[PDB]
Symmetry: D2
Subunit: 331 residues, 4 copies
Amino acid sequence: MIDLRSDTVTRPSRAMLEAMMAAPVGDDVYGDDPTVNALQDYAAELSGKEAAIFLPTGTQANLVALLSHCERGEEYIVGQAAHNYLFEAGGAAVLGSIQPQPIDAAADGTLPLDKVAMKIKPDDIHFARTKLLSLENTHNGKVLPREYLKEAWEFTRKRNLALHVDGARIFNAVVAYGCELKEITQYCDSFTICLSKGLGTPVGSLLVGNRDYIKRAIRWRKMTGGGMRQSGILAAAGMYALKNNVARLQEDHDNTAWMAEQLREAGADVMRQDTNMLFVRVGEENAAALGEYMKARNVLINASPIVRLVTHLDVSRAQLAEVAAHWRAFL
Amino acid sequence: MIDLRSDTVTRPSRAMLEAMMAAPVGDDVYGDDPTVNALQDYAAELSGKEAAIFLPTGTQANLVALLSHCERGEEYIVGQAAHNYLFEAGGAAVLGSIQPQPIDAAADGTLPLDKVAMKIKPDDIHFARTKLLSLENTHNGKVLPREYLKEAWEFTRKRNLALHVDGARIFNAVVAYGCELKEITQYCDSFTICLSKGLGTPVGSLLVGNRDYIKRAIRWRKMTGGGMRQSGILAAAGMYALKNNVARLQEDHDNTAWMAEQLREAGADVMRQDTNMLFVRVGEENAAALGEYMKARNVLINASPIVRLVTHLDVSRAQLAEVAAHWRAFL
Amino acid sequence: MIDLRSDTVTRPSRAMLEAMMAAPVGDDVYGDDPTVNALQDYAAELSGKEAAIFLPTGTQANLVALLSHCERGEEYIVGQAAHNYLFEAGGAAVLGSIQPQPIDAAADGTLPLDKVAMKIKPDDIHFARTKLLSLENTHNGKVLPREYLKEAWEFTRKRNLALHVDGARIFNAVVAYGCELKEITQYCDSFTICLSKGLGTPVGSLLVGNRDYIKRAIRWRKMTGGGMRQSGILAAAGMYALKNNVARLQEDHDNTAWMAEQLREAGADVMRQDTNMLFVRVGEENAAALGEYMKARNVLINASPIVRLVTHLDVSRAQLAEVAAHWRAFL
Amino acid sequence: MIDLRSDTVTRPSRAMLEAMMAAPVGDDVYGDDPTVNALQDYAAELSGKEAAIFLPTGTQANLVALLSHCERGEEYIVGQAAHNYLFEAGGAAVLGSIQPQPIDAAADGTLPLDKVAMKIKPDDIHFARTKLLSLENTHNGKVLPREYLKEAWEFTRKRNLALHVDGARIFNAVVAYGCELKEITQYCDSFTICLSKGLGTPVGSLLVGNRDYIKRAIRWRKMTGGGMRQSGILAAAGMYALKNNVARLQEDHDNTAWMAEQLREAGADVMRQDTNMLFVRVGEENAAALGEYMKARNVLINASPIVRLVTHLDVSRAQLAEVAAHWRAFL
Ligand SMILES: *[C@H](NCC(=O)O)c1c(COP(=O)(O)O)cnc(C)c1O
Ligand SMILES: *[C@H](NCC(=O)O)c1c(COP(=O)(O)O)cnc(C)c1O
Ligand SMILES: *Cc1c(COP(=O)(O)O)cnc(C)c1O
Ligand SMILES: *Cc1c(COP(=O)(O)O)cnc(C)c1O
Ligand SMILES: [Ca+2]
Ligand SMILES: [Ca+2]
Ligand SMILES: [Ca+2]
Ligand SMILES: [Ca+2]
Ligand SMILES: [Ca+2]
Ligand SMILES: [Ca+2]
């Protein structure tokens, strides 16, 4: 019904499913799928990069990204709450033999460069070998400052460190900046793009970067099990998504901001609104009862002291207004 | 438009496509996709197993299968020419920290148990820990003797070893046996099922085993990158294929044996002659040219001193007759 | 000839040397070395543990300790500045496939349990599996409060977590506590003991724990490369040191606090003041020159903005007085 | 008493222990130990290599050698019965993420190059990336043909593959060839040297090779836990061993050959004699009883259908004659 748990729940639109059914395909392992190739060349050109690769999930996109950047024994500085450190079951370490070096992100979602600098290991056999700095744009909805993005870029060049950006929700930051994707991707060596969240595809993600870089990524994609066959049927949804579902993300943002106020006037404690995300401190009491009370009207959220509500193309404001009524009535 | 490179090139049928678009989906990460669940239960019920899991590729199906069976430092005995040892870039060792103990398969495609026994490491700190015997049913078209299957199952039990079967083309074996899937699946703790080859799906594989075993498989799938969202659309295909594309596999088999005689009468040296696979001894660089001659006539093959012709539903006898005609030509 | 770089520079004493040469050996791989066995039993009996194992280094002692405790994909919480996370080139992750979850230690050198609890991963497929809490007693000279030790032990049990203590200098802590080793060892499932630092051995460390735990440690030691032969000669040293070099550690402590006052009265900015370690705030490149000034006078230190002076049995108060004299000089 | 189990049991001679007690030492981590350095420069110059490194065991020497040659995902072609594949608990794979590719050695102990060639993986994302070829000279006593050694050398250069030689018993082959060590080490990029077997040191091994190569080896030695402190006391035994215990290995060889005949005339079935090794097929009956019968007179061998007797400096011919009497009497 009304799912406010994540934007990963968005479903294929009629026009999308059709484009998926009319897509010409080929064996992607042999690199013969027209659609996959098409989706990749497009992504690479829109971002100003040389190559791109389609993957099953964003989790594999990041695992492959990390393996491509870091050899056995190297490390990547990242956030304590970042997806490719916290939410990917420790894969970079467990499977990739890469040393992780996490640090608390600043309140704004960036990684203080002064702190990043303190974590850069001296070239001594006691330490892992620092090699990469991984960011996450839209970090829990948070849009990273553009001045920071430029600064992280310069800093890594000065330290001869790669810079990767987990862009599961990069177009959300993009619509928010009001600029072209290229303007922000010029500040990284590689980044991912998820198609199965706000952009609304059934499955799919992209890793983009330098030609040689992507070349190595291919070997890892195969090893990890991401080398599909006629995956052009999926890449097709991605293309339709990047050409029709980007601008409208501003609608999710406006709704999140609308809901935030409604909830305010409803009595709910609104902690933070950012892009398609809002946070309500519901408390330990009313928490569980909240999930149950909402689940009854077919309203699905992740019960918790602090609830994270996420808006997407499959949730209108009218539906939000209704959810609001139910929240105001929960009191 | 005639592809004999592999059965992985098969494209969706009209029927399949409509079944895919007409399918209900949901976030599989939450287990909310009814189609993924139905595919998994149908597979499980069909082979007499408790549980099944959907994966992007057979490569990830095996890596996950091996990870779920072998702990860090444990070992698996497998064939020098088996897919999960030779054709998966050594993932089990590279990513999973599992020692591989490969041995040559006999001519019938099985692993001589006397050799397997000689490879079981004593419980001594010099050795890895033999944990699993992995087999591959349909091995390069070869169908393992049902007698051996039983022997291997009994052998492992007696030696407290787990048994896994890579069934990328197990249905080709089933059809060749003339029995039910469960009659052969009974001799393995876990087995894999590829839907993207002969069954004609665009993507996907299944790993089938005990409930606890499969539960571990789920964590590994996630870490490896295969935890997709709306896999329903993809699962839908697998459904249609398992109910409508198994039996016809007989047609591919007949075509392979039909073509063997065509190429024989032509002048080619047909070496082997199994299910949907055909092996011809072309000889050096009279083959790298064959790939040219055939490519020119819109006939796609995998040029090599020993060519491997693979049949499937996207190749007909009429087209096969054309290849035999074109083949005999340059001779 | 005055080394304050570390207590790892200590050289064998006359007494120690004769004990080494006068020792009976045998192939430890077969457990045939009476001296290795006696060292291992003495350590075990002394700390109230079932078993102990001899290792080449403390680095291998920890890597093995972590491997024996954590399976592939499991995780350990540790301090951002702990040896087995920061000073061992990330081995636990790189070689053992264990996810590291580091956190900043409080000023007293402990890991705030509230922070540790916040890091325990829920049993969800996105997360690694929190298995162990690793501590480091004597942390850079700091002696952890006995109260905390008990707290950590209780905390872990309640949360079903294992507890390991890196005791490279645990005897420095013991002497500082004024209690018996077993009175602090009781609050950990496993702990390590370095014999090559303050105790004055040329090489070696011990890992102490349960019999089953240590049994696993033995396989890992072998694979890691520490299964030596006639380790008896080396074990002999450890024996002598544990019975003749523990108590004197008080002398190093007094010298450190004596020197703190010497350098204070001189003009240096003594920052910290713990067991056999001393920290001075030198300031940038007025330090890279200090290393020159001192090196010139046969005084070996580890030049740095924040110098770390370490005392041991191969440095006397007389020599310390000389350094204080030479230090005040260039000021 | 009379140990014929292995040559690893040899004990330090009086002159050796003394050289160990008089050796000047330093912290090897800082690279200040005079003796270690001395032992390394000597080994490197005698073999015609640029650098050398001392390690705790030969097992770590090989693990480090493999990690230094192969990055995550690469492979090494080696023997099914080779030490760094079979007797090192699968470390190259388990800890190093290196794919192992074993093949049966020819009867003479070499690895047929024609078979090595068939195992070299094409540069395709399906395969691990072949990088190294590892040999073992003196393989179970067997001295590898010199023409073969030269051939393997050329072959690897033609295929751009590294060539490593596990020389745990290299000086045994050397004394047997009648040439200088350099003449055989010129045919490899790197090799190990064990000091704790025929050469008779308590502990110790060496990895030798190119400067850059050894440099990387150091990082791995630290990670694995082989970076010791005042290990000059051990390296000292090595030096005394390479300058006094090499020539006399011809005495072990002569004795092995003497024993082989005695046992012949005694009634024992002598299968093979090679350097300091002899093999007797004792059978499944008389096997266990043999170990017990011998263990009674203080004669230690490894009971088995086929017994491997190893001679060393701690076993005279007179002792062998006595062992022979006991074997002849066992009938
Ligand atoms: C996925 N979204 C989680 C959520 O519900 O907020 C995600 C990914 C990878 O997605 P997956 O399909 O592999 O699970 C990568 N990075 C971030 C920051 C998120 O948020
Ligand atoms: C050791 N010798 C075993 C025997 O008893 O024959 C060995 C080594 C490594 O020695 P370790 O001290 O690490 O165990 C490496 N390579 C070979 C061929 C042997 O044989
Ligand atoms: C094709 C194949 C695989 C891998 O399948 P993907 O889905 O392409 O990764 C594994 N095993 C066998 C025996 C195969 O034929
Ligand atoms: C010195 C030290 C180690 C490592 O010791 P090695 O024997 O040199 O590897 C580990 N932990 C601490 C806390 C140390 O001070
Ligand atoms: Ca979606
Ligand atoms: Ca297909
Ligand atoms: Ca590994
Ligand atoms: Ca010392
Ligand atoms: Ca690893
Ligand atoms: Ca010895």
